[PDB]
């Protein structure tokens, strides 16, 4: 996955990556 808001968690659009 790729974390697009750089928070350290995988959530939203990040889960389809
Ligand atoms: Lu995130």
Your description of this structure?
The protein has 17 residues and is largely without helices or strands. Helices cover 0% and strands 0% of the residues. It has no helices and no strands. The termini are close together. The relative contact order is 0.45. It binds lutetium (III) ion. Lutetium (III) ion (LU) binds at residues 3, 5, 7, 9-11, 14. The PDB classes it as de novo protein. Keywords: Lanthanide-Binding Peptide Lanthanum ion, DE novo protein. The assembly is monomeric. The entry is titled "The binding structure of a lanthanide binding tag (LBT3) with lutetium ion (Lu3+)". The protein: LBT3. The organism is Homo sapiens.
Q: Report the end-to-end length measured between terminal Cα atoms.
A: 5 Å
What compounds sit in this structure?
lutetium (III) ion
Number of strands: 0
Main beta sheet: strand number and arrangement?
Answer: none
Shape: globular
Structural class: little secondary structure
Summarize the structure.
By secondary structure, the chain is mostly loops.
Which properties best describe this structure?
17 residues; little secondary structure; binds lutetium (III) ion; de novo protein; Lanthanide-Binding Peptide Lanthanum ion; monomeric; LBT3
């Amino acid at each position: 996955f790729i974390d697009t808001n750089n928070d350290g968690w995988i959530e939203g659009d990040e889960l389809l990556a």
